[model samples]
Target: SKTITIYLDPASLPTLNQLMHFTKESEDKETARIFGFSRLPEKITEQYNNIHFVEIKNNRPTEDIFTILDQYPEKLELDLHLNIAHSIQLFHPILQYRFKHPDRISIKSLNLYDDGTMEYVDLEKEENKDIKSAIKKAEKQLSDYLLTGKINFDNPTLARYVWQSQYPVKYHFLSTEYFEKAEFLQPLKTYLAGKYQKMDWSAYEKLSPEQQTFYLKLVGFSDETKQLFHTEQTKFIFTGTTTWEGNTDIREYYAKQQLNLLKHFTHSEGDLFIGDQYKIYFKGHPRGGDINDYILKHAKDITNIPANISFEILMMTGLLPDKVGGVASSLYFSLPKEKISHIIFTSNKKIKNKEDALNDPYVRVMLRLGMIDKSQIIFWDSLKQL
Candidate 1:
């Protein structure tokens, strides 16, 4: 058996210990757990006892969990809450567990990018500091607009922020009959970070006044807690092709265009995360554009998946033109290894090549579909459409 030693953030100690204990419960599986039991040595405790646990007073103000991780890139993994945490996002508990007992296993660095790309934004780097500052400022400003209703809920940037925060925002024109056409919904949905780009208000404003007024009424907030909430059933419906042209659309657009995509279906990941978000691929037809080259060239076209997951090819095609779009393939299925229900992902692209990916779409599909056990599969679960 191998031994793994953990260097934990002090505040994370208890949660880590609990996780270790729960994982070690199955004597049969304990052999694979590799950690030398769940006891924390006094020497180790003495050092971490003082580490401040990152917490929110009432979940209002939050410390970017990613920001904290950015401070300690070398820290392998963490045991943390995986829900819609107001303070932190997805925390890889198993990886942290592996660190606690490395003897039984051999581990390497943690990669967090959602698309399987391993781009680390060095929190210590001055450039990243500037970026982080900017993101924070934007989030704060939008959060205020939400609380005070200073801006019309149709504000695209604010909607993106609300989705980013998993919080709620409202609008004024769900039933205004402004968006009775498909063109209106396309830009309206695309405006709210369709799949690849963040909503750029300036560029969006360049459209005609008719288009502008139409969006102001149809593109509402995510929830009805505020005003002008268009229950999905009650909202205007548009069936049209959108050549999504930005970062938000690249990241969030469906494999085909299912704007109704939810966290339960698709995975969330990016250059900044510690690992990819396990999510169902959305479905939408991909139209023409040079922008989707990155996604089409890199992603797998997973098909015959859950009904919620459509247009796997379209999604890949839609992503070709992302400014920061990275290499990756996605699918949505529950991971049995983690013994937890979630969208699971597998990617070694950062250390592999295009042929490595193209070489085996079948395996990728199999893995994402849970046809094979993750522990035993060496190939990416990517599958290509024949």
Candidate 2:
């Protein structure tokens, strides 16, 4: 009764993962999934049309998408819309479903854009600002909007974080719509006058340990690689931040901070770290836009780190990295907790503030599902004093 569409332009990979589950639990098997892409060549479109073997429907973020969705019907899932995340004015139907059909659908919003495609959905087209302004002219624009990172650290694992967002930022709009930890797939039910009622991860978590290892490998990991780490004696692995356009500043700042910690761990008398014989490796962002690239470019031994490797191989080969440190990276989500002994993520003055922290997608989502303590995060400045 339902199917999914994977926008050809880098649709969510996890969408494929979820769709596979739906297919397994399904009764009748017909079409697998519809591929989503824009503006195919006229010749290709005609070829498929003539064969009558293919049916193509162009999906958009606008209202017309509803007519197309009616054909496939319920349990629809899609990548998050890219339109500017206005503090008020919620209208894009793709995203609107999260609030409208909250229980029936799961909207997996990814932090995929290397650039700011935030004005529209996937493509870089601006929204109708005038219409948005007019609508706003007439609307409590939401009381100081908030988003928080919710995680259950007691038994925190990586399978859920690996599938969904690494940082799960559940929004509590108007201080009332917040999501509770137990609400897996977050129920569609709404609260009446503040009245109400989560991944115990039984399904994804129970994937015959090997199957669990298999999925992470599908993205990029392998038994051979973990063995390589074992051979190399990798004790701790440090990650670099994404050097994507706007994030370079953090990338630069974090490298220096990370270096300080690296020295303390490596030096014989530097501090209270485990024996200095253990190995430490630097894993560069797969995309390579990072401090690894920067230090090499300027020939500066600033970070003084070595043995740079791809994030994937590092995770698989150096399997048990006691300390996996970094500011944030999308690839960071691909790691399974079984391989991670402890993770230390940095926080700034802004992220320390609960409200501001939620606005930053990276800082919030990694925290949403797993259990990591506030102590793991360095607020940098004073906490209660602020």
> Highest lDDT among the candidates is held by which one?
2
Question: Can you give the TM-score per candidate against the true fold?
Answer: 0.17, 0.39
What is the overall TM-score of model 2 with all chains considered together? 0.39
Best by TM-score: 2
Q: Write the per-residue lDDT of candidate 2 for residues 1-386, one digit (tens) a residue.
A: 23343222222332233322332333333333333322122332332321111222332333444445545546755433211232112112444444555566564443221111121121111122232232222221111111111222221111111212222223211112123432421321221123221111234445556555544443333445444454545466555444333235676764555555444444456442546545656665445456666534543222223333344333322243655654444444444433333333345544544345344453343355453333344322221110
The CA-based lDDT of model 2 is what?
A: 0.35
- RMSD (CA, Å), candidate 1 to true, equals 25.6
Q: What is the lDDT for 43 in model 1? A: 32
Q: Rate the local accuracy (lDDT) of all candidates.
A: 0.27, 0.35
